[PDB]
DNA sequence: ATTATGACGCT
DNA sequence: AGCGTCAT
């Protein structure tokens, strides 16, 4: 009844850039604009690996993780932009700096949580309360929501997509009761108005387009954002959840895309998120543990409480490189050379970070992978990070890993290393 | 030879 | 702490 929490206390948005690395390259090179194009790293092995794809190219079936040579088979006129290489490795600085552009604009509207290089969550609860006050009981015009979808609408008693968007929007608005300053649906709508403003600002000031989801929590906001990309935003109301989840594969929900989600499906013998409602909290806790069980019980009802953390900057700064196949490092000075290259990029990014953000990393994590292992990281060791100097860091990294070498000979490295990883962690204010 | 990251959970 | 999971 009225005691039952419905998880409608917050207004949360997720803003995610469209085809982000592609857009970064398209802004820089006008020739790539409005074309099937993709961003690739490296070149020698099968044309390089694709990590971002324009929507024009997606129509041909081009995807992430596809080799460029294979993508060219689906899309002969596919244009390609290469990730910069520095010190023998891919360097993502251009995209990180483009990310900062967007993050700083979003921060003008509310405190954000950086969730990836191209997306951030927004807690709009306070901002919505203040827009509602200066509205002072005026209806929200559809003109204020020019790119907004309302999930689940229209319904009941039409052949074009923009026409459908508007029909759904008018059904939504004409059902809104704005007399109520605590109405969750009204609060979401105002949230959507603000996000329209945010997204306009991002495009105006960077040239980048993005999509967004507006709901009552992070999981629903993330799900919403993807429903109508690119260059659109979607509102998922609490009321839309039963229909939405009744046919929603469990793997589509954030954190359930892996082994846990597979276990939910296998153990319970279900396919869709909505089917979870038929289990007690204790039942779910028994199968998936106390934390996961409570989380699942609430989530399948559209309820989740993970807060938007006040964190705009990444907590770690890392440098990594794979050495696949026959390129695996088999000599000590090979290992030492590449540790230096990684450490030099790390020092560069660390020094920039210290100046920009008034902080200093205090711990260096070293990770390697060995030939034969299917694990991402065969070993992780930490040591102290007392100075921002590449030679010191690479020498220290070598020290903490050098006895991983099985080889009785000290000049040769056995078994060959197929990955190196340097990560600066544990920041302190400075 | 699906690369380069980055956050959070478990024990 | 070191490892595993999930993620973009
Ligand atoms: N697995 C990955 N490996 C390396 N880089 C990645 C990977 N996934 C994503 N990226 C980079 C490239 C992307 O442009 C950027 C944003 O990722 P993501 O939001 O998932 O897709 P996207 O922005 O390229 O397209 P869209 O969000 O419109 O579907 O992060
Ligand atoms: Mn994106
Ligand atoms: Mn993203």
Integer Cα distance of A54 and A52 in angstroms:
7
* Alpha-carbon distance values, A383 to A296, A362, A411 (Å): 38, 9, 24
Query: With a 6 A CB cut-off, is A40 part of the ligand 1 pocket?
Result: no
**Burial degree of A375 (CB within 10 A; 0-12, 13-18, 19+):** exposed
Q: How was this structure determined?
A: X-ray
CB A16 within 8 A of CB A47: no
Both structure tokens of A225? 């954002």
CB A398 within 8 A of CB A413: no
Both structure tokens of A32? 């790539």
CB A245 within 8 A of CB A300: yes
Question: How many CA atoms lie within 13 Å of A33's alpha carbon, on the beta-carbon side?
Answer: 8
> Any idea which nucleotide's C1' is nearest the CA of A255?
C6
CA angle A123, A126, A129 (to 5 degrees): 130
Resolution of the experimental model in angstroms, please? Answer: 1.7
**How far is C-alpha A51 from the chain's CA centre?**
14
Cβ atoms within 10 A of the Cβ of A1, count?
Answer: 3
Backbone CA torsion sign across A136, A139, A145, A149: positive
| Residue ranges of domains in chain A, CATH in brackets | 1-18+89-249 (3.30.70.270), 19-88 (3.40.1170.60), 250-307 (1.10.150.20), 308-430 (3.30.1490.100)
* Residue to probe by mutation, ligand 1, list A14, A19, A50, most atoms within 8 Å of CB: A19
CA angle A20, A23, A24 (to 5 degrees): 90
Both structure tokens of A7? 């998880």
Residues lining ligand 3 (ion), CB within 5 A?
A: A 16, 116, 118-119
Q: Mapped to the 3 state alphabet, what secondary structure does chain A carry?
A: CCCCCCCCCCCEEEEEECCHHHHHHHHHCHHHCCCCEEEEECCCCCCCEEEEECHHHHCCCCCCCCEHHHHHHHCCCCEEEECCEECCEECCHHHHHHHHHHHHHHCCCCCEEEEECCEEEEECHHHHHHHHHHHCCCCCCHHHCCCEEECCCCCCCCCCHHHHHHHHHHHHHCCCCCCCCCCHHHHHHHHHHHHHHHHHHHHHHHCCCEEEEEECCHHHHHHHHHHCCCCCEEECCHHHHHHHHHCCEHHHCCCCCCHHHHHHHHHHCCCEHHHHHHCCHHHHHHHHCHHHHHHHHHHCCCCCCCCCCCECCCCCEEEEEECCHHHCEEEHHHHHHHHHHHHHHHHHHHHHHHHHHCEEEEEEEEEEEECCCCCCCCEEEEEECCCCCHHHHHHHHHHHHHHHCCCCCCCEEEEEEEEEEEEEEEEEEC
Integer Cα distance of A153 and A139 in angstroms:
19
CB A419 within 8 A of CB A369: yes
CA of A167 to the centre of ligand 3 (A): 29
């Amino acid at each position: 009844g009225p005691h039952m929490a419905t998880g409608q206390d917050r207004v949360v948005a997720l803003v995610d850039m469209d085809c982000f690395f592609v857009q970064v390259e398209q802004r820089q090179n006008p020739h790539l604009r409005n074309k099937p194009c993709a961003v690739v790293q490296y070149k020698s092995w099968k044309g390089g690996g694709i990590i971002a794809v324009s929507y024009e190219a997606r129509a041909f079936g081009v995807t992430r993780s596809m080799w460029a040579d294979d993508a060219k088979k689906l899309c002969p006129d596919l244009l390609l932009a290469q990730v910069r290489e520095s010190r023998g490795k891919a360097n993502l600085t251009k995209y990180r700096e483009a990310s900062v552009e967007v993050m700083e604009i979003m921060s003008r509207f509310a405190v954000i949580e950086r969730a990836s290089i191209d997306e951030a969550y927004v807690d709009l609860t306070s901002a919505v309360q203040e827009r509602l006050q200066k509205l002072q009981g005026q209806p929200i015009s559809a003109d204020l929501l020019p790119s907004t979808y309302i999930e689940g609408l229209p319904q009941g008693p039409t052949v074009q997509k923009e026409g459908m968007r508007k029909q759904g929007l008018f059904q939504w608005l004409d059902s809104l009761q704005i007399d109520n300053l605590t109405s969750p649906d009204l609060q979401l709508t105002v949230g959507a108005v603000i996000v329209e403003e945010m997204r306009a600002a991002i495009e105006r000031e960077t040239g980048f387009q993005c999509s967004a989801g507006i709901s009552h929590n992070k999981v629903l906001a993330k799900l919403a954002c993807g429903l109508n990309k690119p260059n659109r935003q979607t509102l998922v109301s609490h009321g839309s959840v039963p229909q939405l989840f009744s046919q929603m594969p469990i793997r589509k929900i954030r954190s359930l895309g892996g082994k846990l989600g597979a276990s939910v499906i296998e153990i319970l013998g279900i396919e869709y998120m909505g089917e979870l409602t038929q289990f007690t909290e204790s039942q779910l806790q028994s199968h998936f543990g106390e934390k996961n069980g409570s989380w699942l019980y609430a989530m399948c009802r559209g309820i989740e409480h993970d807060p938007v953390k006040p964190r705009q900057l990444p907590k770690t700064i890392g440098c990594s490189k794979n050495f696949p196949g026959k390129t695996a490092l088999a000599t000590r000075e090979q290992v030492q050379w590449w540790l230096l290259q990684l450490a030099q990029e790390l020092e560069e990014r660390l020094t920039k970070d210290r100046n920009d953000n008034d902080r200093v990393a205090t711990q260096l994590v070293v990770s390697i992978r060995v030939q034969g292992d299917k694990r991402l990281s065969s070993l992780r060791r930490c040591c102290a990070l007392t100075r921002y100097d590449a030679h010191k860091m690479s020498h220290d990294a070598f020290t903490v890993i050098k006895n991983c070498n099985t080889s009785g000979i000290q000049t040769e490295w056995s078994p060959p290393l197929t990955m190196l990883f340097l990560c600066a962690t544990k920041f302190s204010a400075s």
